[PDB]
Structure 1
Amino acid sequence: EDETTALVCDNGSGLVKAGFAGDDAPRAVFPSIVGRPRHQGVMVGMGQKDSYVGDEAQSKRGILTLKYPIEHGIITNWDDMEKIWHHTFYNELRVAPEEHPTLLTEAPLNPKANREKMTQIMFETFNVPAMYVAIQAVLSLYASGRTTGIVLDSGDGVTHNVPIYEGYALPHAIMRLDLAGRDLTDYLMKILTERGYSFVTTAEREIVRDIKEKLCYVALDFENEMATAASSSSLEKSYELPDGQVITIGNERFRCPETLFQPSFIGMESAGIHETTYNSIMKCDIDIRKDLYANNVMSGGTTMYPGIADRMQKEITALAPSTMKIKIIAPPERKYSVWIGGSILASLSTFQQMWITKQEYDEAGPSIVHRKCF
């Protein structure tokens, strides 16, 4: 065949998004979890199966202890990551990696060891002709079809912010902020406890993740919505657990995403996500700032909450000069924007010479990641 296709995988924490390069959507999207039978089984003709990977672990949740292998964009456990990639290629996509070049995404300001060990596994585990590791935020920018913007990337791993102008990139102005979907989940199960609902274990920690994926929203003013929580009507929502227990969540619902704009609630000094965007834009040159204000791109899974775009717009407009208009461009489909940006990149004809070849790795070693790529 011509061009050989190519393969693209996004592994921020929480979800593997994977598929062929040259398509508009990934074939396989599943949770990045390795769930191990904690309870010793007593039957004959079970499994045994040392561990379960992917949405198999979601189905068989109650037995398992679940371990996310990626925390804060950092792989904690390498064998668990290899198992997840083994699951992507053989269980879903049914590809031999020898037949495809593979793009990986990776997060900004990330330890060198993750990029270098990630390449070491791609060559010396799944034999592969070529690969690339690319920055998450630039891929979302490509997916949005814009040449310029400040990309606010927040996954389940960590929050990142990369300003770009006309292509280029500003290394000093790149900001990484330790907040995530996962930290909002840990805050959320903590704020359910005051209501009497106690979720203590990894299995129902993913149940509050599912709650937060739909019920939670961001206030267009926090204090105003917290004041109208005195007359509870629309702010309460009934939620059904898989147990058949019913949960009723009021003001507790919208103050969980409020943590992004008030990290004093989590107990971290690190500024809210709108001030981090100001911190990135202020580090940029005076000239370009006009379009960075007007071309803010949201990406990732934890920018999905209803009303985030409006809240960021009101806060950035309030802080900034009202001399210029602050447009925020946050697409629906923004969850998959990194994978789509990886699809478009590996489909680019020129990019087919910028691959890290297997040959170039075999001569010059794993350290060449940083030398060739950003």
Structure 2
Amino acid sequence: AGRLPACVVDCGTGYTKLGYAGNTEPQFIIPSCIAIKKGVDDLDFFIGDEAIEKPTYATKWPIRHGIVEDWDLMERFMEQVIFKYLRAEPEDHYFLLTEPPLNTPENREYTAEIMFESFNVPGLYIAVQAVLALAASWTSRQVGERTLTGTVIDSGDGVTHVIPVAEGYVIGSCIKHIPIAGRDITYFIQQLLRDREVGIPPEQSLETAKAVKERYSYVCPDLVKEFNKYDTDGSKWIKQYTGINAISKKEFSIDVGYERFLGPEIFFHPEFANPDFTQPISEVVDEVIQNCPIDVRRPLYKNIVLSGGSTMFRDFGRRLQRDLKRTVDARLKLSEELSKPKPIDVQVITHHMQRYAVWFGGSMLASTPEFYQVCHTKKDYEEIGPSICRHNPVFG
């Protein structure tokens, strides 16, 4: 580690988080999109928020299911990331980028070709998102043992993944998905609101749900109890949102009810919103641990870690831990009472750095002298080849 901190860039399907190693929050969180229209026609583009309407440019999304799908466009998006937002002279900073688990070696070579052949970085490291989220949880009070075994609940853009991790290495064959993520909570809240509250501009229907979700939601311990609380003490529980008719500039006034707690509930009752998929998040986690190697199951249940916006609802962790515990002892009941093994310690770890767990993890690691030891250098890339970037030894 020299005078200058490394650049840390975490490219997700929905947002890219970027800034410098050492800091606690990204310096920019910008949507992962690039609007485009001989010469320098290639330089006529915008990214992030500036890219979203832009009367005369088409908005593109180079990353799908966490994987770069348009390499020309990801390359261009890098150019502004480095020269417009970070204002890093890329020849003087090591870089740490990220990847979904199951991204291919070939893609890491493609990424390296971009970083070393176009931008001449001195050093590169591609980390797995899951692994940085574990590393993020070492920030937690409930954590004294620094470990990179654990189960990672990543609720990203479009689905939520339960990623089992042992000793730095994702167990690829054991990953499972849940077709529930923040968008759906929004969609369901939109649903619930649509048929109760009058005067949501049909056009601003979505933005209103998002606002309610982000401002008023939470996870409850029990629906019926929650319902009667609301039924009784309306003045405590029902809340007010006021918005602003975009077209016709007239405000509207709604109540915020049941959707406060029914929104996030669909993690726990996917049947409420998805007609094809009904297994609660809790069951899915259980299944994943039980599929993994026996000798690693206790560690997994002991260190379940959250990452992403959707995991931030007050009490998400508590409820997850509770329900998983109920499952786990249900099994260990139907076993003792069928002819007596140790009870399972189930720990769901929460902490402040959750929303950008991944980016925080990388920022912290790329601050350490060891990060400089494990990065591939440009001299390596030239003498041995892009294949060096196929493997990124874990460290910490």
TM-score, normalised relative to structure 2: 0.76
> 1:363 and 1:132 mapped to 2: Cα distance?
17
Residues 10, 98 of structure 2: 8 Å contact kept: yes
> 2:6 and 2:209 mapped to 1: Cα distance?
36
Displacement of 1:198: 5.9
Partner in structure 2 of residue 354 of structure 1: 374
Q: How does 1:281-320 map to 2 (within 5 A)?
A: 281-320=289-328
Partner in structure 1 of residue 365 of structure 2: 345
Partner in structure 1 of residue 5 of structure 2: 5
Q: Are 1:53 and 2:47 an aligned pair?
A: yes
> 2:228 and 2:72 mapped to 1: Cα distance?
49
The alignment partner of 1:88 has SS state of helix
Residues 240, 254 of structure 2: 8 Å contact kept: yes
Partner in structure 1 of residue 260 of structure 2: 253
Is 306-315 or 205-214 further displaced after alignment?
A: 205-214
Residue deviations 1:54-77, cap 9 Å, x none?
34457x799998665434323455
Which residue among 128, 137, 140 is the counterpart of 2:130?
137
Which residue among 73, 97, 116 is the counterpart of 1:104?
97
Relative to structure 1, the CA distance from residue 333 to residue 120 in structure 2 (aligned partners, 3 Å threshold; closer, same or farther) is same
Partner in structure 1 of residue 350 of structure 2: 330
> 2:107 and 2:158 mapped to 1: Cα distance?
14
Residues 190, 205 of structure 2: 8 Å contact kept: no
Relative to structure 1, the CA distance from residue 254 to residue 75 in structure 2 (aligned partners, 3 Å threshold; closer, same or farther) is farther
> 1:200 and 1:364 mapped to 2: Cα distance?
59
TM-score, normalised relative to structure 1: 0.80
Residues 270, 279 of structure 2: 8 Å contact kept: yes
Residues 161, 175 of structure 1: 8 Å contact kept: yes
> 2:178 and 2:103 mapped to 1: Cα distance?
12
Relative to structure 1, the CA distance from residue 164 to residue 75 in structure 2 (aligned partners, 3 Å threshold; closer, same or farther) is closer
Residues 70, 157 of structure 1: 8 Å contact kept: no
> Which amino acid letter does the alignment assign opposite residue 284 of structure 1?
C
The alignment partner of 1:151 has SS state of strand
Relative to structure 1, the CA distance from residue 197 to residue 290 in structure 2 (aligned partners, 3 Å threshold; closer, same or farther) is farther
Partner in structure 1 of residue 335 of structure 2: none
> Which amino acid letter does the alignment assign opposite residue 376 of structure 2?
I
User: How many pairs does the alignment contain?
Assistant: 361
Relative to structure 1, the CA distance from residue 119 to residue 23 in structure 2 (aligned partners, 3 Å threshold; closer, same or farther) is same
Identity between Structure 1 and Structure 2 (%): 39
Q: How does 1:1-374 map to 2 (within 5 A)?
A: 2=2, 4-34=4-34, 52-56=46-50, 68-78=61-71, 81-110=74-103, 115-145=108-138, 146-147=146-147, 148-167=149-168, 169-195=170-196, 196=198, 205=206, 208-226=209-227, 228-231=229-232, 232-243=234-245, 244-264=251-271, 265-269=273-277, 271-321=279-329, 323-361=343-381, 369-372=389-392
Displacement of 1:283: 1.7
Partner in structure 1 of residue 248 of structure 2: none
> Which amino acid letter does the alignment assign opposite residue 239 of structure 1?
Y
Q: Which has the higher helix share?
A: 2
The alignment partner of 2:263 has SS state of helix
Residue deviations 1:173-195, cap 9 Å, x none?
33343432234334443443323
Displacement of 1:87: 3.5
Displacement of 1:318: 0.7
The alignment partner of 1:109 has SS state of coil
Relative to structure 1, the CA distance from residue 128 to residue 315 in structure 2 (aligned partners, 3 Å threshold; closer, same or farther) is same
Residues 299, 330 of structure 1: 8 Å contact kept: no
> Which amino acid letter does the alignment assign opposite residue 88 of structure 1?
V
> Which amino acid letter does the alignment assign opposite residue 30 of structure 1?
I
Displacement of 1:138: 0.9
Question: Alpha carbon RMSD of aligned pairs, Å?
Answer: 3.5
Residues 269, 278 of structure 2: 8 Å contact kept: no
> Which amino acid letter does the alignment assign opposite residue 286 of structure 1?
I
Residues 107, 160 of structure 1: 8 Å contact kept: no
Is 320-329 or 71-80 further displaced after alignment?
A: 71-80
